[PDB]
Amino acid sequence: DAQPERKLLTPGEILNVFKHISPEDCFRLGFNEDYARPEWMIITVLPVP
Amino acid sequence: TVALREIRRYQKSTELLIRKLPFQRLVREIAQDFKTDLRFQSAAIGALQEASEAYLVGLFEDTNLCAIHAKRVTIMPKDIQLARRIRGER
Amino acid sequence: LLIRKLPFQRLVREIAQDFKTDLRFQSAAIGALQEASEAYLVGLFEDTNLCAIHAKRVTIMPKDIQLARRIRGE
Amino acid sequence: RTVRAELSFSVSQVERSLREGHYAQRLSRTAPVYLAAVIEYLTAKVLELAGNEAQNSGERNITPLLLDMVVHNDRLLSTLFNTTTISQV
Amino acid sequence: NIQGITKPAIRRLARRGGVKRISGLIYEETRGVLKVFLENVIRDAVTYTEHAKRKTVTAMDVVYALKRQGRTLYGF
Amino acid sequence: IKQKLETQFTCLFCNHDNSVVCTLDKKNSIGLLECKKCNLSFQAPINSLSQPIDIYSDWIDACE
Amino acid sequence: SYSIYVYKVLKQVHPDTGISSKAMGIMNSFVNDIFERIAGEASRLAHYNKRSTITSREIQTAVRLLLPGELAKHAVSEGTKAVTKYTS
DNA sequence: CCTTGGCGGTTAAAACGCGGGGGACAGCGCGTACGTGCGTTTAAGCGGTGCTAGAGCTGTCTACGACCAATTGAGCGGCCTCGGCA
DNA sequence: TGCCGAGGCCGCTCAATTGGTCGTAGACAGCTCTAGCACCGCTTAAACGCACGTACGCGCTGTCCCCCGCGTTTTAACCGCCAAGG
Ligand SMILES: [Zn+2]
């Protein structure tokens, strides 16, 4: 047994990790390179209706 | 004969002869008796096991020589009680 | 000291000549060598004795000395 | 100075280690060249035998089993490794 | 416990050492020699860890503890 | 089976909060408080009804 | 640290034979050990004579002290025939 | 409909009793070469001046290499171009 | 036929060079210490033979505890099931 250090996984931290996912692994995860790219689930600019 | 066979084999190889898990438990137990919940790098325990097995093997060489000196083929307590004394361990 | 000191000095100067030439020795240097040598030999004889007794031999033999020296890593 | 002395170890990096080890207050002009030359000799004597034993046995690379078999054999340098233990892990 | 150093692991080690036939009163002795060796090396490894203000005994603390017994260990 | 639980209690010595771990061994009726920081350890008896607040209460009275 | 030069000497002594990745760490711990032993011993030498500069002479003596016999002879001949080739 | 509290099911091997069968521990017999206390005589060992000087101890003097401070050149990693094997 | 493997160019970070202090390292002198090497008188310590004894070693015996194989079986350690809650 060892002392674990759980730190918060901020959106910005996760955002950079997602852009480095390869196209071949993007497909295998059921996402889609043209229409549903996985880093687009994080919001950086909000559309104003 | 099978004894000789094993000696030809083990002396040929270099894998650790004590089970990993058990050794990890012994080390952590003993260490726990000096300082509570001490965390260990895996390499630390590995270092301890390499050192311990090299030590025991050498000890068994000397022990063997002590047994053979007394015209015996079987290692006993009087062998180690002698090897370790001459080593300055006791 | 149990060895004639002078003999330890002779032997010493002889051995030393084989390493470096025209050497001189302080008397205390030779004395140091003799204390060390005799202490070493005495301890060795203790261990040898233990080997002999181990082999139903309380009386040291060359075999005993050789075992002792092998286990010492000498 | 390493190619100029026709050596293979850097007199520089080792000298930097000496500065960082703080083994003295001031080094000499030619002390690290001697220490790198001497060290270089020990590496080119151990690896010369590891490369002799890899081709004597028939091995291609050099494994730690080759180092453990050589340095405890070869009474030339087995005295340097009386009290060493190659981990093999 | 020390009982994890089993009978056939001490026998295997003896086989590596060159022992032919081994008497029964040697495993306990080995268990008692191995425990002394670990109590001498782990004390120094824990001393280097408490000196380094750590809580994890790394492998270089074990290499330093074996170096303080004339048992230098290469590969860590 | 033992229960290893983290708590939101403050260690009475090092004062780090949310760093006290409680190990309750009901098979032998022995509860164990541990810090994760200074790692001070405290043992106390537990029943079958006890919870991390029961031994942490016994630790407050064992100091005072 | 010293692993980049072990392979560079190995290319001279055996340009055909390669080396593993654990054996490089073993040769690197061997080099950092015989370095911190020769420099340590040399440091002891510079203190016993109350000097302040480690010259090549304290390295030649620490090589004579540490290495036994023919390894010290060869060790002192390679350092001497490297310092002389250096000064020229 | 989904994920933890404690519980069977999941292996490499040893917890080896215990059936078999023999290497070899310690006491006992004989049995021989070597082996030290005491004995002789000795050649070196312990303690004293006499003589003679090498270099350590301690003092102040003169001195050359490192510390930390501004310059600035080569090795290495990230772009970026060139090129023959598939 | 053409793009990823390798060498070249542009930045990064640490190494190399130069100039002023600066106390410590090297020189050097005065001078007393214990090591210098040569001879006496006496003595504790050493070279060589003895011999009946205790220890050192070889051979045969008992019975006896580790020797080798098999089988599940159990801790320790990796993979799936009971039926309560939110
Ligand atoms: Zn605390």
Domain ranges of chain E: 1-76
* CA C38 to each of CA A12, C1, C35: distance values in angstroms, whole numbers, following the listed order: 76, 7, 5
CA of B22: nucleotide with nearest C1': I76
For residue G55 the two structure tokens come to 């010259």
Residue whose C-alpha is closest to residue G81's, from G62, G56, G58: G56
Do chains D and E touch by CB distance (3+ pairs < 8 Å)? yes
Q: Tell the CATH superfamily of the E1-76 domain.
A: Histone, subunit A (1.10.20.10)
> For residue E49, which of E63, E34, E30, E69 has the smallest C-alpha distance?
E63
Question: Is any atom of nucleic acid chain I found less than 7 Å from the CB of residue C2?
Answer: yes
- The binding site of F for Zn(2+) comprises 11, 14, 35, 38
Q: Which residue matches tokens 């036994």? A: G68
Secondary structure of residue G63 in the 3-state scheme:
helix
| Cα(F4) to centroid(ligand 1), Å | 17
- Tally the C-alpha atoms within 13 A of residue D70's C-alpha that lie toward its C-beta: 21
In E1-76, which ranges are continuous DSSP H helix? 7-17, 27-51, 59-67
Ligand 1 is a single-atom ion; what residues have CB below 5 A from it? F 11, 13-14, 35, 38, 40
CA–CA distance, D47 with D65 (Å, rounded to integer):
13
Secondary structure class of A18 (helix, strand, coil): helix
DSSP assigned state of B85: H
Which residues in range 5-64 of chain C are in contact with strand I, contact meaning CB within 7 A of any of its atoms? Answer: 24-28, 52, 55-59, 61, 63
What does the block give as tokens for B12? 């040929």
Q: Is the CB of C1 under 7 A from strand H?
A: yes
Question: From the CB coordinates, do chains B and F have 3 or more pairs under 8 Å?
Answer: yes
Q: CA torsion angle for B33, B37, B42, B43 (degrees, to 10)? A: -60
Count CB neighbours of D5 within 10 A. Answer: 22
Q: Look at residues D11, D9, D13 and name the one whose alpha carbon lies nearest to residue D28.
A: D11
CA distances from C48 to C4, C54, E37, F14, G52 (A): 23, 10, 25, 58, 46
SS3 E73: strand
Torsion angle of C-alpha atoms F42, F48, F51, F56, degrees rounded to 10: -30
Q: How was this structure determined?
A: cryo-EM
C-alpha distance from residue D26 to each of D23, D34, G86 (Å): 9, 16, 20
User: Which of B79, B12, B30, D83 minimizes the C-alpha distance to E30?
Assistant: B79
Give the separation between CA D53 and CA D58, rounded to whole angstroms.
8
Kindly list the residues from chain D whose CB atom is less than 8 angstroms away from the CB atom of residue B51.
Answer: 85
What element of type H or E holds F21? strand F20-25
Pairing, β E21-22 against β B74-75 = parallel
Ordered alpha helix ranges (H), B1-90: 2-10, 20-32, 42-69, 77-87
Q: How far apart are CA C57 and CA G86, in angstroms?
A: 61
Q: CA nearest A30: which of A15, A41, A43, A45? A: A41
Phi and psi torsions of D4, nearest 5°: -65, -40
The SS3 assignment for B89 reads coil
Query: Nearest nucleotide (C1') to the CA of residue D15?
Result: I15
Tell me which of B32, B35, B37, B39 to substitute to probe the interface with F (most F C-beta atoms closer than 10 Å). Answer: B37
Q: Strand pairing partners for B75? A: E22
Q: Say if the Cβ atoms of D27 and G1 lie within 8 Å.
A: no
Question: Nearest 5 degrees, angle CA A28-CA A33-CA A34?
Answer: 145
What is the set of domains in chain G, with CATH numbers? 1-88 (1.10.20.10)
Four-residue CA torsion sign, D10, D11, D13, D18: positive
Q: H48 C1' – C40 CA distance, angstroms?
A: 34
Q: How far is the CA of E6 from the C1' of H19 (A)?
A: 24
Cβ(G52)–Cβ(G46) under 8 Å?
Answer: yes
Count of domains forming chain D: 1
Go through the domains of chain C in sequence order and give each one's CATH number.
1-74 (1.10.20.10)
User: In whole angstroms, how far apart are CA D78 and each of B53, C30, D73?
Assistant: 20, 32, 6
Instruction: Give B78-86's long-range contacts (Cβ < 8 A, gap of 24+).
Output: B78/C54, B79/E26, B80/E26, B80/E29, B80/E30, B80/E33, B81/E29, B82/C50, B82/C51, B82/C54, B83/B59, B83/C71, B84/B59, B84/E33, B85/C50, B86/B62, B86/C47, B86/C50, B86/C51, B86/C68, B86/C71, B86/C72
Q: Is residue E26 a contact partner of residue B84, using CB atoms and an 8 Å limit?
A: no
Write out the residue range of the structural domain in which residue D67 sits.
1-89
- Residue ranges of the annotated binding site of F are 11, 14, 35, 38
Give the distance, in angstroms, between residue B20 CA and nucleotide I31 C1'. Answer: 72
B5 in contact with nucleic chain H (CB within 7 A): no
* Torsions phi, psi for F45 (to 5 deg): -75, 145
Residue of B69, B71, B79 to mutate, testing the C interface (most C Cβ within 10 Å of its Cβ): B69
- The whole-angstrom distance between B57's CA and the closest CA on chain C is 13
How far does CA G21 lie from the centroid of its chain? 22
Which are the contacts of F52, defined by CB distance < 8 A and separation ≥ 6? F5, F7, F9, F22, F24
| Nucleic strand I near CB of residue G20 (< 7 Å) | no
